[PDB]
């Protein structure tokens, strides 16, 4: 009725919710890396 390994089964959830936050972090990085060269291309064109 209770939880078998509460601390471990909860650390799994913490890791699962942090992996998504980290993966969403690199998206901003690549988006701004695209924005810079996109502005450069606008100026050149």
């Amino acid at each position: 009725e209770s939880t078998s390994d509460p601390l471990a089964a909860l650390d799994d959830a913490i890791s699962q919710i942090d992996k998504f936050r980290s993966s969403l972090g690199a998206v901003q990085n690549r988006l701004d890396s695209a924005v810079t060269n996109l502005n450069n291309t606008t100026t050149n064109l």
Binding site: L7, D11, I14, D18
Partner: protein, 50 residues
């Protein structure tokens, strides 16, 4: 950083739990000494009645 702060909070809570266990041990030991006093008195009374 997240796993770091998780471990930190856990260790603090574990220290608190250990302190609470120390308190429980002290209380039970006081009770046991209280029993031992009466046991020693009964021992002396038996030595007297022998």
């Amino acid at each position: 950083a997240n796993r770091f702060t998780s471990n930190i909070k856990g260790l603090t809570q574990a220290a608190r739990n250990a302190n609470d266990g120390i308190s429980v041990a002290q209380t039970t030991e006081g009770a046991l000494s209280e029993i031992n006093n009466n046991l020693q008195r009964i021992r002396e009374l038996t030595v007297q009645a022998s």
